[PDB]
Amino acid sequence: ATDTGGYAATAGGNVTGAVSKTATSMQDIVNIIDAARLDANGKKVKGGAYPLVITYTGNEDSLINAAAANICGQWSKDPRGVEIKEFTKGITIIGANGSSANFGIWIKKSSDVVVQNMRIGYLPGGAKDGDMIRVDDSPNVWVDHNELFAANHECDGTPDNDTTFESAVDIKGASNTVTVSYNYIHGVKKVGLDGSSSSDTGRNITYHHNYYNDVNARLPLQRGGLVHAYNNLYTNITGSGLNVRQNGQALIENNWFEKAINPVTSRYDGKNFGTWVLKGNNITKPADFSTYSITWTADTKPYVNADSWTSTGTFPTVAYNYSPVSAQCVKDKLPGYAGVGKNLATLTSTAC
Ligand SMILES: [Ca+2]
């Protein structure tokens, strides 16, 4: 139906009248979307003329491998990405098994977009917003079962010493409902925003069943709104995890944290700290910090860490249906369900 296991409720291009097309390259995707705006008389229709299900069969392993072998050469290149602008008819971009992209997907002022089974990595243009997936002013977006990766590393001499690579999943603007699920995100410094600035507050986002490994920060960097993070596996977090800011509220439930510095915090603003409701994670009390290698650091400005591992606020009744498996099951089974080529498999109690 329109069940994503989170705030976003969409079927994307899988609706009545959907037109199935095969994209063999980045350019095909661009041309296919362009043609999907035309009605029977060749006239443009605002929002798109018909629903789409694009199956990407392209492979850019050569670009990815070359980039991996010389990471510091990526930031200064031109960014590469497909833009889904003002397309509200319903669109699903699914990669075929074995497919890969050295380009991102930038969604803007659209809605009902599903991006699945895409293996995206080592994108050029970190200094010019070379995001892997960007969700801007776009509600009902479901980013599911993808592998987004780069190298958790900052080359020196890059603009703002932060542009070696851009983000995995940046969300900003009026992207009111978004679900980010079953993604394998690794080797990424700035995972993803949830609000581009202090003023860009709001949105209701669900992060579930994601496997993060070797990521520095922003899981997400939340500015206001609501975030529901459940059944995620967070390992090797080298900077900070969920950074709840501008009075945002987060429900952090049944996740597995391990080898993480500041997994749950509120820093960098010095005020308007966000709150969290901790429930059912592998960590239940401070005594578990040493067990799972959780480390905490202070910050130059006033901050709040979850070092007491107690809930600091409340969370509204979650608007959707979902059934979280235990944190232990996440730890044991998630790596086989998250990512590409899993045939979009989901983790159920049964499989625990
Ligand atoms: Ca970005």
List the one residue out of 84, 83, 88, 174 whose CA is nearest residue 130.
Answer: 83
Binding site, residues? 129, 131, 166, 170
By DSSP bridging, strand 264-266 and strand 81-85 are unpaired
Binding site for Ca(2+), residues? 129, 131, 166, 170
Residue with the two structure tokens 């990471």: 71
By DSSP bridging, strand 264-266 and strand 304-305 are antiparallel
- Helix or strand holding residue 34 (H, E): helix 26-35
Report in angstroms the alpha-carbon separations of 9 from 47, 158, 180, 186, 317. Answer: 18, 39, 12, 27, 17
Q: What determination technique applies here? A: X-ray
Question: Radius of gyration of the chain from Cα atoms?
Answer: 19
List the one residue out of 347, 1, 339 whose CA is nearest residue 140.
Answer: 1
- How many residues in total does the chain contain? 352
Question: Looking at the annotation, which residues are catalytic?
Answer: 218
CA–CA separation, 206 and 265 (whole Å)? 18
- Helix or strand holding residue 327 (H, E): helix 327-333
CA 351 to centroid of ligand 1, rounded, Å? 36
CA 28 to centroid of ligand 1, rounded, Å? 24
- Considering Cα of 174, then 197, then 240, then 301, what sign does the dihedral take? negative
CA angle 137, 143, 144 (to 5 degrees): 165
List the one residue out of 150, 327, 120 whose CA is nearest residue 229.
Answer: 327
* Dihedral of the alpha carbons of 308, 312, 317, 320, in degrees to the nearest 10: -50
Backbone angles phi, psi at 294, to 5 degrees: -95, 130
CA 300 to centroid of ligand 1, rounded, Å? 25
Which runs of E-coded beta strand occur in 122-248?
133-136, 141-144, 147-149, 169-172, 177-181, 184-190, 193-194, 204-208, 211-217, 221-223, 226-230, 233-237, 242-245
CA 134 to centroid of ligand 1, rounded, Å? 7
Measured in angstroms, the resolution is 2.2
Order of strands across the sheet with 249-253?
19-23, 52-56, 91-95, 113-116, 141-144, 177-181, 204-208, 226-230, 249-253, 275-279
The class level of CATH for 1-352 reads mainly beta
CA 135 to centroid of ligand 1, rounded, Å? 10
Report in angstroms the alpha-carbon separations of 26 from 57, 66, 89, 253, 312. Answer: 10, 18, 20, 37, 45
Residue with the two structure tokens 């080298």: 238
